[PDB]
Design a binder for this molecule. Structure first.
Ligand SMILES: Nc1ncnc2c1ncn2[C@@H]1O[C@H](COP(=O)(O)OP(=O)(O)O)[C@@H](O)[C@H]1O
Ligand SMILES: [Mg+2]
Lengths: 51, 459, 590, 459
């Protein structure tokens, strides 16, 4: 039971560290890039309407 | 007082109509076109249509006639200028009547017998004369009246999605609102006709109409009338509260519909749209509409506000929710998950808060345990949500005692406390008693946010 | 008699036209192309031509008709196909004898050669008649056995002469109304502007439900006879299939299938499929095309016709409501109506507001949708009609943030949101249960208590089960489904079964094309009873794995409940589900 | 008796040119200008370029020059008004001919001996005169013949991206697009010489030049003729299919390039733009092009459009693919991810769709199991993609037995069923048998989408 719990805890801690360090910066950067891209599209539409 | 009204002002009838573009009617050779002047066009078929001028030039006015321009002819269309912007005949007897988007009564009763003609735009309240909201308005909604308190004179909006029963919650609040005199002023803009008749029969058959000046604006009703409606409700509220010394608690419905109406009014004047198509000055317009509420030092009345929004795509980053959150203090959220899980009201307390709650939940007003009970309930609801998420992760057995009890509290909270009948009225004291009844499943040591004296006296 | 001063595409600008009115039909060009004046900038008058402007020169005559866009309401429109305006496509093909549509063809919207049987109503000569009153009953079809000849609204007076019972055409006068001195004459048909809502005495709260046939709709997100619904979703997703399902199998006594901005092959499929299907609403089974009208406007027709077809369909539905028939108009591609509006606004030069759409998009959509609702038609005798507006929206890119989708969502009462992920997996009807909603459940509690008392409780239970299982599935995706609770696994299995055998039905399969209200209620009760039995048995102590191994037969029976054929009638189908409950209860003992 | 008239109409030579903005030539003193009228711009050099009138004022007539405005002056440029819209000389002899983008032959052959002149814009085919396409085209591609069926009279584009073998897939369909022979009208709009030479070689090897017509508007050719090319090709296809009773398989390529040509013309006209600057009427133009395909009552011919659309950034939400998928009757989706994996044809079956599959894949037309097998394959492929995502994110051991089986199904579906290679020619029945071999991995209990009768008969 101790060995199985050690393996499970190692896998879970690796999963938490992976989730945070990889995914959360990755998804946050994707959100920022998407917001920037739609902001650029809105700015282009605004410029066309101003013209 | 109002004695200069005994003056007959002749009205100029301009046959000259230069152009008719979209919803606008462009006149020509006008004498002295006042901005925002109300205009009564006379179609060749004989129908009369109200209008409001949008852009002014040298002997040229652009009239934005209501009900569209279908039938407007250049050759034969008399245009009558009323040398005054839109004004409503306010009275103390308009409590108990239903008015249209343009202020015309749509009741079986007569036109309201005026006491004064107030400009719908109104004047800004002097900040030196403004007063911090102090007392509570008791609402039948136990979730609101306990966890997100409404103080007399604040602006607390309700954020909802399209399908959530925000209109039903509005009707419930209008029916059960009261002091813990009162006179609700209800304004619905861009509302579906089924919801409008629902408001009609609800207020007529529950006795709430003797205290409500209902302002219904249909979706098919004119969009400029949709613009005018919240101004009408706030002007009536200003009259009642400040020139009558009573509390109002206006409930504006479909601020999203009002924002769309503002969009159409702005784009009709050849103006570029702002961020999400909405006009850039939407912040200023919403600020006027909202900050038209509040308490004053000289008068004993108050104007509370519950502008009920409809968040498109359930996005808080949407301009209308963002600007409303900026201008107003606090917010009440209606949750799609809660609506799917159960029944009225689908209000979740985790994202919903009231900024001036501490003033409403005091010692002399309501009960001295209100703040502690509400904070404890919020904390234990958060812990219950965490435990509900954690059960499927770590198994039900492995949860601690403080997590199993918190899950039981969450069940009895989303199923008995928040869950309220659409017609049942819960006073603030009864709601606090029920909150204690839920909180008594814990050991006296578990309740940490509550003060020891309150725990000893109430638990 | 004006003259074109500019063309610049579909929006001609005719000059030297004084006295014009907005939305007045002028006859542009020598071929007498119809149009609609939409800007009067002095002498000039911008006109949106409903036909293909190709060849119109500067100097061609434009003449003002003296009437807004008017449909020819009357007997003769119950199986015909109409263009964006109101032009019989069958008559056009039979007259021009061409596979195309001749440019500027002038064919009457109603066939004036058909002799219609007429039988006068209770009104007699000398009686005072009011607008909307009934003064006849024309036998049109087997399904439409009495097409009431309504007196036109806003036209009243004292009846001076009425025609006796006999076979009359659509041009022979039938009624002479004295009115205020000027003796008018009323024939079988009568025109009415399409942008002016037809008058009603008083609208009512729609109570009886519109049985869509689809289990998801009719169970979780019901609609009422008189309600406004939307089905937004990207291309695919089954918007058109749901529309045709409500067109074929519905409780409505009449239907107007508007097809603005729709493929021509969609209208061809409707015309080829509808005559095959039959309904027993009348005494005997009769074809669908005897109660279905198609305002078919293909996507290549001018955008002005796309704009006009929505109003033509809604005013036809309003007419059949004024007759007292529970109609359910099904608009197709309301987003394409909005796209036509956007194109027209762009050609005019008006400033777009939201994502290129015009600022008045919300106002136009509200004016169109508000025409719905159960209402008592004005005039005697009293009779109740309904116009259910089942309009399909196709937002650009499949995002529900589109301006047309947002406006329609705010205006309507029901929303059958579709998901591209479910559509691509062929999980039709592909209803997005999380976002979809219906505001008519509160009203329908009365009908459910009358007919199927346990229906609201079962629907709420299934919604709660689906929401709980969605949360549990999110947690499973997060945490690898490690040591899931027995009850949690039960809810997950039951919800997967519900999604795969109750919310998934092939609308083209013979057994699941139409799931009636009784069959879907029995299936709901069977699913809820299975879930409750599993919950109770596991709470007693039974392991879920062994329980599933033992009750796989019952689970397969509940799955085959979707394969149960509704053609056997209520008596046979209800008895079959009675055995399923008995079998499910038997497994509880074991 | 066919009635054709001899008549000579003199044409005015307008020397007055008052603007050569971009690709648009603006005249000044035109007498009664005619909308959508062909004009000939005699350059000072001597060469004449065709033009089309896009807008007429009282005296102006804006003309778009198909061959570009390079070299156009004002003093010595004369515009000759032909007085009629563009009418391509159509004949049954066009088969085997290679034309330019403007309809002028480039195959070193004579001008086509006209049998009739047909308007390029055509006319809307009567919806009552149409026939629902029910005969299924047995394209050799398994990913199409199964799970997205093509009928005679369908408009099913190929949504691809830059670098993907859309040309190869369309050429494969053209080689093997028989029933369960097809004349080909191939329209090239701004494709490169590599693609044009590939298609020409593809047709010559398969012997299609005996019955094909090519309208090659290469990338070197002027960009405005990309507007005129698809209309020319489709009116030729309409002539053949209806007036000759042939079975035309129209293959448009670079519809994205056609839409770019529209944007170039729309931007020059300074019209109010839609999404990404594309004209607000691009939906109407694309619908006019696409909806010229289908079966017609009485006529024994049909048009089967397969417009090769290349999505600019592989994003289906782009206006061109969005409107094309909204107008057409389906789409074939070519996946960059599958191409990177090395699968040919890289047809991503999930986004792909065929609205006529429901009627063309019934019993009698094909085997009784076509619809059930297609639905089951779709469901299991979606489950496979979800299982692949789960394996990528969560650990592989956490995947269930069903998840592992579905991963194996995805592997053998992509690497054995979709992978076909050119010249393979899988019959519909053979493809269905291979699909069943794929579905035999699962136990009969797991196959939910298969009806019990078909499951008993074929498993
Ligand atoms: N309820 C359903 N049953 C069976 N097939 C369906 C169903 N709904 C949609 N489909 C399939 O989806 C395909 C296209 O759906 P359709 O309704 O044409 O999309 P759109 O709404 O974009 O027109 C059709 O080929 C049809 O087979
Ligand atoms: Mg469709």
């Amino acid at each position: 039971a101790f060995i199985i719990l050690d393996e499970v805890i190692k896998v879970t801690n690796r999963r938490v560290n992976a989730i945070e360090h990889v995914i959360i910066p990755r998804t946050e950067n994707t959100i920022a890039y998407i917001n920037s891209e739609l902001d650029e599209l809105d700015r282009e539409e605004f410029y066309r309407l101003k013209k | 007082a109002v004695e200069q009204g005994f003056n007959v002002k002749p009205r100029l009838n301009y046959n000259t109509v230069s152009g008719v573009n979209g919803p606008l009617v462009i006149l020509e050779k006008v004498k002295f076109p006042r901005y925002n002047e109300i205009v009564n066009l006379t179609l060749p078929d004989g129908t009369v249509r109200q209008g409001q001028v949008l852009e002014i030039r040298g002997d040229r006015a652009i009239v934005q006639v209501f009900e569209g321009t279908s039938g407007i002819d250049v050759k034969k269309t008399t245009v009558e200028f009323t040398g005054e912007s839109l004004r409503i005949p306010v009275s103390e007897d308009m409590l108990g009547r239903i008015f249209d988007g343009s202020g015309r009564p749509i009741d079986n009763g007569p036109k309201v017998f005026a006491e004064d003609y107030l400009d719908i735009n109104g004047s800004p309240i002097n900040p030196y004369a403004r007063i911090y909201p102090e007392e509570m308005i008791s609402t039948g909604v136990s979730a609101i009246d306990t966890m997100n308190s409404i103080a007399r004179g604040q602006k607390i909006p309700i954020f909802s999605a399209s399908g959530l029963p925000h209109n039903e919650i509005a009707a419930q609040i209008c029916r059960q609102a009261g002091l813990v005199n009162f006179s609700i002023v209800f304004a619905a803009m861009g509302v579906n006709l089924e919801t409008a008749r629902f408001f009609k029969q609800d207020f007529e058959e529950n006795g709430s109409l003797e205290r409500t000046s209902l302002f219904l604006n249909l979706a098919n009703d004119p969009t400029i009338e949709r613009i005018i409606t919240p101004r009408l409700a706030l002007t009536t509220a200003e009259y009642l509260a400040y020139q009558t010394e009573r509390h109002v608690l206006t409930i504006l419905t479909d601020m999203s519909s009002y924002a769309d109406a503002l969009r159409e009014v702005s784009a009709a004047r050849e103006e570029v749209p702002g961020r999400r198509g909405y006009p850039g000055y939407m912040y200023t317009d919403l600020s006027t509409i909202y900050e038209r509420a509040g308490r004053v030092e000289g008068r004993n009345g108050s104007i509370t506000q519950i502008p009920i929004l409809t968040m498109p795509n359930d996005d808080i980053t949407h301009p209308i929710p963002d600007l409303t959150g900026y201008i107003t203090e606090g917010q009440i959220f209606v949750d799609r998950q809660l609506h799917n899980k159960g029944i009225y009201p689908p209000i979740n307390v985790l994202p919903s808060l009231s900024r001036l709650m501490k003033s409403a939940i005091g010692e002399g007003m309501t009960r001295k345990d209100h703040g502690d009970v509400s904070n404890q309930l919020y904390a234990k609801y958060a812990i219950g949500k965490d435990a509900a998420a954690m059960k499927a992760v770590v198994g039900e057995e492995a949860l601690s005692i403080e997590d199993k009890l918190s899950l039981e509290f969450l069940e009895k909270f989303e199923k008995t406390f928040i869950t309220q009948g659409a017609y049942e009225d819960r006073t603030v004291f009864e709601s606090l008693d029920q909150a204690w009844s839920l909180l008594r499943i814990y050991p006296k040591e578990m309740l940490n946010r509550i003060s020891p004296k309150i725990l000893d006296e109430f638990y | 008699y004006g003259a074109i001063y500019s063309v610049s595409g579909p929006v001609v600008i005719a000059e030297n036209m004084i006295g014009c009115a907005m939305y007045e039909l002028v006859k542009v060009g020598h071929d007498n192309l119809v149009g609609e004046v939409i800007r009067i900038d002095g002498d000039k008058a911008t006109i949106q031509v409903y036909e293909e402007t190709a060849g119109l020169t500067v100097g061609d005559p434009v003449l003002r008709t003296g009437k807004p866009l008017s449909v020819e309401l009357g007997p003769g429109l119950m199986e015909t196909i109409y263009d964006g305006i109101q032009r019989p496509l069958k008559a056009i093909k039979e007259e021009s004898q061409s596979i195309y549509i001749p440019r500027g063809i002038d064919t009457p919207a109603l066939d004036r050669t058909i002799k219609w049987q007429f039988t006068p109503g209770k009104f007699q000569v000398g009686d005072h008649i009011s607008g909307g009153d009934i003064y006849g009953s024309v036998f049109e079809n087997s399904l439409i056995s009495s097409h009431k000849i309504l007196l036109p609204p806003r036209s009243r007076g004292t009846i001076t002469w009425i025609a006796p019972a006999g076979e009359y055409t659509l041009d022979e006068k039938i009624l002479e109304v004295e009115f205020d001195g000027k003796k008018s004459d009323f024939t079988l048909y009568h025109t009415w502007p399409v942008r002016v809502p037809r008058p009603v005495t008083e609208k009512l709260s729609a109570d009886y439900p519109l049985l869509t046939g689809q289990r998801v709709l009719d169970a979780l997100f019901p609609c009422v006879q008189g309600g406004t619904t939307c089905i937004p979703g990207a291309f695919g997703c089954g918007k058109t299939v749901i529309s045709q399902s409500l067109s074929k199998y519905s409780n409505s006594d009449a239907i107007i299938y508007v097809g603005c901005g729709e493929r021509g092959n969609e209208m061809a499929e409707v015309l080829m499929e509808f005559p095959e299907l039959y309904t027993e609403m009348s005494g005997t089974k009769e074809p669908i095309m005897k109660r279905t009208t198609l305002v078919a406007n293909t996507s290549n027709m001018p955008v002005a016709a796309r704009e006009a077809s929505i109003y033509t369909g809604i005013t036809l539905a309003e007419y059949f409501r004024d007759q007292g028939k529970n109609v359910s108009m099904i608009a197709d591609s309301s987003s394409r109506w909005a796209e036509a509006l956007r194109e027209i606004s762009g050609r005019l030069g008006e400033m777009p507001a939201d994502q290129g759409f015009p600022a008045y998009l919300g106002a136009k959509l509200a004016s169109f949708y508000e025409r719905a609702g159960k209402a008592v038609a004005l005039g005697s005798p009293d009779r109740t009609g309904s116009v259910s507006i089942v309009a399909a929206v196709s937002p650009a890119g499949g995002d529900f943030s589109d301006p047309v989708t947002t406006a329609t969502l705010g205006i309507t009462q029901v929303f059958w949101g579709l998901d591209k992920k479910l559509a691509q997996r062929k999980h039709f009807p592909s209803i997005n249960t999380s976002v979809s909603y219906s505001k008519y459940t509160n009203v329908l509690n009365k009908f459910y208590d009358s007919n199927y008392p346990e229906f609201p409780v079962l629907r709420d239970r299934m919604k709660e089960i689906l929401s709980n299982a969605e949360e549990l599935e999110q947690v499973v995706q997060l945490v690898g489904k490690s040591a899931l609770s027995d009850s949690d696994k039960i809810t997950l299995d039951v919800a997967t079964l519900i999604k795969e055998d109750f919310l998934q039905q092939n609308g083209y399969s013979t057994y699941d094309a139409f799931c009636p209200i009784w069959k879907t209620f029995d299936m709901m009760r069977a699913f809820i009873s299975y879930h409750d039995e599993a919950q109770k048995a596991v709470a007693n102590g039974a392991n879920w794995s062994k329980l599933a191994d033992s009750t796989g037969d019952v689970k397969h029976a509940v799955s085959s409940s979707k394969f149960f054929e509704p053609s056997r009638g209520e008596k046979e189908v209800h008895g079959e589900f009675e055995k399923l409950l008995s079998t499910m209860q038997e497994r509880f003992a074991e």
